[PDB]
Amino acid sequence: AAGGFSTSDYDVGWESPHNGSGTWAYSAPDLLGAWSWGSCAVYDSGGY
Amino acid sequence: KYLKSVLRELVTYLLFLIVLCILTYGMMSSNVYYYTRMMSQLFLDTPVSKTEKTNFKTLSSMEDFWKFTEGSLLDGLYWKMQNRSFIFYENLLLGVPRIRQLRVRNGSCSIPQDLRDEIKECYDVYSVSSEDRAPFGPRNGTAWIYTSEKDLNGSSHWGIIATYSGAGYYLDLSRTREETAAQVASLKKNVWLDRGTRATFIDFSVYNANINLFCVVRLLVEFPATGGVIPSWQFQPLKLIRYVTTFDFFLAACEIIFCFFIFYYVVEEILEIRIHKLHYFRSFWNCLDVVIVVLSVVAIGINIYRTSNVEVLLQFLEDQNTFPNFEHLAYWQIQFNNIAAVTVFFVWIKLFKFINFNRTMSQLSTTMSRCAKDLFGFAIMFFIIFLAYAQLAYLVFGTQVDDFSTFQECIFTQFRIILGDINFAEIEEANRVLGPIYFTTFVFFMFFILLNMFAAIIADTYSEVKSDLAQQKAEM
């Protein structure tokens, strides 16, 4: 029971981007250094 | 020599056979088959109601399906939530079902002119040109208005009865068991499958959220023009979420290795037939390799094309407010099953192609039937000794060990000792003499003298097989 992944910005609390970027930005993955390969998923260096 | 012409081709053929066997073993769906069997048992064997005796496999009247839809089909499928879809709280159905009815048009036949005063009309069998398209009875919406075959994601199939196309009335279920039952009752009260009908069908999906297996289940019913109807069901386990964990990685690696081996074999066998003796077909050795290569390539391509897109399941899971067009996916899964049967046949053909050293097929049965006799003779001595020791242990350690308590348990205890699961804590404590003696003598007579006799028998059998082959095959 899993789906996609979020990629957008959200303010304090959760989604309400008012002025510029969300105060909890996405912080796109680094070029090199990721792939943790979890129990039954494969992630990268990106995330809030 | 015999190092490049007699040590490589046979080894390569054996490796190819091993790869084919591995690929065939990595294609047996156990959980999907069990889920399909459970769904069929809860559906095909489901009667109409508690008092009625109209089941799916006993279709004998037009009210059998109507009485079946409200009853056991509402208990094994339309179970209330804790309205979800979980009968035993473990069979989670996917999405919602849909119903289709390919009926004969109003006036699908003609009555004789000589008997036009008493004969009105008739209905033909289900077909592309014998499917109703105009309204049939009170058609407020799509409940009695047939949908186009191209506009309703339908096509001809030409199954066991007829080629029922996508034409016919269509309807969608609801998201609640009570609402589905009410809709079924409303459809049964009105003329939905009238006397001018030819075939009916229903399609649902099953997810079983606890298990990663999303399959489709399609029930069908062939209403013949000579009265009555014959129902049936079919389950298609079509999935495209194979890449999960290390098992999926191993399967993918095996598939890639098989593809590379097939490519290498094609490269190695495409040069000695072009710049060499060509048109060799009735040779039993040159056409077979080409046929095997072509069949392997075609099967690999078909398997790859079957999983060209995997967006159908993702789209169904993201939005499950209707019944998706899973008929095409079910047809693709049926074609994949046919391809799997063809691949089993191709594995048999590869085994035949591994029989290049022939004449050793039925001249050795007399020796195998003697080895079997020797093994049967040995099994009597082994079991006599085993039960003697078991009786000794049960009489001595009977009342004080909790392991040699019952006779049916002493046998399992001794088997576990043989496999190497000895305790030896109570055995010595329960009796300091005849406790160590029993264990020591048992080990000595079961691992040094009686287990080495089983190997010697087979050693002699192998030696005599080698001797008689190297005698007769190499003498004449």
What does the alpha-carbon distance between residue B262 and residue B12 come to, in Å, rounded to a whole number?
Answer: 11
Whether the CA torsion B413, B415, B419, B420 is positive or negative: it is positive
Chain B from 238 to 267: CB within 8 A of any A CB = 244-245
Strand order across the B146-147 sheet: B146-147, B168-172, B93-103, B197-206, B215-222, B230-236
Interfacial B residues in 23-82 facing A (CB < 8 Å): none
What Cα–Cα distance (Å) separates residue B50 from each residue in B57, B144, B449?
Answer: 16, 30, 65
Tell me: is residue B419 an annotated ligand-binding position. Answer: yes
- Nominal resolution (angstroms): 3.3
- Residue in chain A lying closest to B247 (CA): A40
Q: Which amino acid type is present at position A41?
A: A
The 8-class DSSP code of residue B203 comes to E
Phi, psi at B418, each rounded to 5°: -60, -45
Q: Do the chains contact at B318 and A3, CB–CB below 8 Å?
A: yes
Is the separation of the CB atoms in B415 and B409 below 8 Å? no
B98 CB-near residues (< 8 Å, 6+ apart) = B170, B171, B172, B173, B202, B203, B204, B323
CB atoms within 10 A of CB B180: 22
Query: Smallest Cα–Cα separation from B351: which of B13, B33, B1?
Result: B13
Query: Which run of H or of E encompasses B11?
Result: helix B9-25
Nearest to B407 by CA among B420, B424, B389: B389
Distance from CA of B245 to the nearest CA of A (A): 6
The Cα–Cα gap between B470 and B157 comes to 58
In angstroms, the separation between the Cα of residue B156 and the nearest Cα of chain A is 34
| Separation CA B185–CA B178 (nearest Å) | 11
Contact in structure between B296 and B269 (CB atoms under 8 Å): no
Q: Does A12 touch chain B (CB under 8 A)?
A: no
Contact A1 B209 (CB under 8 A): yes
Instruction: State how far the alpha carbon of B122 is from the alpha carbons of B78, B106, B136, in Å.
Output: 37, 9, 15
Q: In the numeric block, which tokens belong to residue B433?
A: 């003499």
Q: What is the dihedral of CA B312, B316, B322, B325, to 10 degrees?
A: 20
Radius of gyration of chain B (CA): 33
Q: Which amino acid is at B15?
A: L
Taking CB atoms and an 8 Å limit, are A3 and B209 in contact across chains?
A: no
Q: What is the DSSP string of B221-279?
A: EE--TTS--EEEEEEE--------SHHHHHHHHHHHHHHHHHHHHHHHHSSTTTSS---
C-alpha to C-alpha distance for B98 and B376, rounded to whole angstroms: 60
| Cα distance from N-terminal residue to C-terminal residue, chain B | 23
Query: Residue B70 to residues B75, B229, B256: CA-CA distances in angstroms?
Result: 9, 19, 50
Query: Which phi and psi (to 5°) does residue B329 adopt?
Result: -65, -40
Q: After which residues is chain B broken (C to N over 2.5 A)?
A: 82
Q: Do B187 and B167 meet the contact criterion of CB atoms below 8 Å apart?
A: no
Helices of type H across B277-424: 286-306, 311-318, 327-353, 365-396, 407-419
Method of elucidation: cryo-EM
Cβ atoms of B2 and B255 within 8 Å: the answer is no
Instruction: Name the nearest CA neighbour of B291 among B345, B358, B359.
Output: B345
Q: Do B318 and A1 touch (CB under 8 A)?
A: no
Q: How many CB atoms lie within 10 A of CB B445?
A: 13
With contacts defined as CB-CB under 8 Å, which chain A residues touch B314?
Answer: 3
Residue B115 has which token pair? Answer: 């008997």
How far is Cα of residue B302 from the mean position of the Cα atoms in its chain? 19
Structure tokens at A4: 């996609």
Interface contact A2, partner B, CB < 8 A: no
B311 interfacial to chain A (CB closer than 8 Å)? no
Q: Which of A1, A3, A40 sits opposite B245 (nearest CB)?
A: A40
Please answer whether residues B215 and B234 qualify as being in contact, where contact means their C-beta atoms are separated by less than 8 angstroms. Answer: no
* Residue B162 burial (CB count, 10 A): 20
Q: What's the rounded Cα separation, in Å, for the pair B222 and B191?
A: 18
Q: A38 forms bridges with which residues in the sheet?
A: A41
B:314-343 residues touching chain A, CB 8 A cutoff: 314, 317-318
Rounded CA-CA distance B187/B190 in Å is 5
Query: Which amino acid is residue B189, in one-letter code?
Result: K
Task: Write a three-state SS string for A1-48.
Answer: CCCCCCCCCECCCCCCCCCCCCCECCCCCCCCCCCCCECCECCCCCCC
Which residues of chain B make contact with A1, given a CB cutoff of 8 A?
209
User: Packing angle between helix B177-189 and helix B62-69, nearest 10 degrees?
Assistant: 160
CA–CA dist B66, B74 (Å, integer) = 12
The DSSP bridge partners found for residue B232 are B220
**The two structure tokens encoding residue B264:** 């290498």
User: With a CB-CB cutoff of 8 Å, which residues 128-167 of chain B face chain A?
Assistant: none
Give which of B326, B306, B357 is closest to B473, Cα–Cα: B357
Residue A42 forms contact with B (CB below 8 Å): no
> Which chain B residues have a beta carbon less than 8 Å from that of A40?
244-245
- State residue B176 phi and psi, 5-degree precision: -135, 145
Contacts of B143 (CB under 8 A, 6+ apart): B169, B171, B187, B190, B192
- Number of inter-chain CB pairs under 8 A, A vs B: 6
> For B244, which residue in chain A has the nearest alpha carbon?
A40
- Which bin fits B413, alpha (ψ -120 to 50), beta or left (φ > 0)? alpha
Helix B246-269 to helix B286-306 angle (10° resolution) is 140
Hey, CA dihedral for A24, A25, A26, A30, is it positive or negative? negative
Residue B117 CB partners (closer than 8 Å, separation 6+): none
Residue B110 corresponds to which amino acid? Answer: S
Backbone angles phi, psi at B200, to 5 degrees: -135, 155
Question: Kind of pairing, strands B168-172 and B93-103?
Answer: antiparallel
How buried is residue B348: exposed, middle or buried, by Cβ count under 10 Å (0-12/13-18/19+)? exposed
